[PDB]
Structures are given as C-alpha cells and as structure tokens.
Amino acid sequence: ALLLNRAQMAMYFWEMGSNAVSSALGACLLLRVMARLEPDAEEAARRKDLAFKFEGMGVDLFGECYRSSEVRAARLLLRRC
C-alpha cells in the first residue's frame, strides 16, 4: 500500500501489524526515497503528505513508549531490526 500510494490502506496495515515504530520510520523511509524515484511531482505531493502521516504516528507512538519506560523504549531504537 506504500508502493501504490494507497494512503488509508497503508495507514491501516501499519495498525494491524507488528513493528509499529520501525515500520512508521520505514514507511517514512520509502516515501521520501520513492518520491525522488518518481517522475511527476503531482502525485509526489500525496507521496510526501502520507510520509508526514507516518511521521506523525511514529513520533506519537514512541513518545508514549518513552514515557512508559525510558529503558525499554531505548531498546526500541537500538534493536537489531
């Protein structure tokens, strides 16, 4: 759903899987890369907007996990993904 720029599908498939923080950062990694690999800049506006929406959820979900346990959310970043 990230590849075909299906916004609400990717926003839902992130919610039903494991690896919330890494795939929110992973979704942000693809959509900034794949906008540079995109020829036309019209759909790249939707490609970059949906990258900010995963930037919202990764920041929002990690800030919950960090205020829960600063030790156990430290291990969230430095996990060998």
CB of 73 to a second copy, least distance (A): 12
Contact 10, 1 (CB under 8 A): yes
Instruction: Based on the shown chain and the rule CB under 8 A, indicate whether residue 67 belongs to the binding site for a second copy.
Output: yes
Cα(first)–Cα(last) distance of the chain, in Å? 21
Q: Quick one: which H or E segment has residue 32? A: helix 20-36
Beta carbon of residue 20, minimum distance to a second copy (angstroms, whole number): 20
CB of 50 to a second copy, least distance (A): 16
Q: Which residues bind a second copy (CB under 8 A)?
A: 42, 45, 67-69
